[PDB]
Symmetry: C3
Subunit: 114 residues, 3 copies
């Protein structure tokens, strides 16, 4: 799985250790070994949510399965909880788009997962 | 809905006001209150379109419905028009990918839109 | 087609000519005309792969067709090979997400490809 966060929160306000905490909590949440989890955090962005430039986040989670109704509500509570705790962003100023990827449409290591 | 613009136009050429203008124009165009519209503009990117580094943009528009053949033509005319007028980019150097997102695959406020 | 690369490799390690090589090789692999190929490279990113901050990349390839099982394995071989040779990134620290885009869902030049 791959988790990407784009935020207007400044780089100085992203705590040390955040990439590792995202990797650990996503490995646990998805029930996958951490060797499979990629994370990416992009601060200092020019973005607005509902016309306001108060802290906000636009994020994505891609996974080959383990995506769906109840699972996504659980991911949202975990990930908004981390973004509120670590980056001080309110949960109602966060969007996370979930993508169930087909194994044939994920490349890695010169081939795909198919 | 969520609109993202990535462009090689430099940061000083993006007008103050452009994020607000996009928020209002998209609220009008999607029929959704502006409180729901998230916008994000990333200038200074290393990109090319047809091998050329003339001003160009790679964009995406995600919405829970309000996505389809004739709606997408109208969004492309609206959004290319804003990009040409404000960032001086040729409409034929712009790509906009449209995503009709399932409510259960958009997280927000600790849960999803389902 | 559009190919995006996000990486933690520093901007100074991305060689001159990389965007043009990706454009040409993408045209060679997809058979699509170079004039319509877009490429985008984002270095200096805060990202981890498998809990490690060794060089890695998260990428995406969008194309209106020319996407599927055998084609995607071929693209992964080509693109991991360019990232290893030019950015010194190990192929097993690269993810590439592939998207077969509906022509109606790709805006360009005030309209769509539908």
């Amino acid at each position: 799985p791959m988790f990407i966060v784009n935020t207007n929160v400044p780089r100085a306000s992203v705590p040390d250790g955040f990439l590792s905490e995202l990797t650990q909590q996503l490995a646990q949440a998805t029930g996958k070994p951490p060797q499979y989890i990629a994370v990416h955090v992009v601060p200092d962005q020019a973005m607005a949510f509902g016309g306001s430039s108060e802290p906000c986040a636009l994020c994505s989670l891609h996974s080959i399965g383990k995506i769906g109704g109840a699972q996504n509500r659980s991911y949202s509570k975990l990930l908004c909880g981390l973004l509120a705790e670590r980056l001080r962003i309110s949960p109602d100023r966060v969007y996370i788009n979930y993508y169930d990827m087909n194994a044939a449409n994920v490349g890695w290591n010169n081939s795909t997962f198919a």
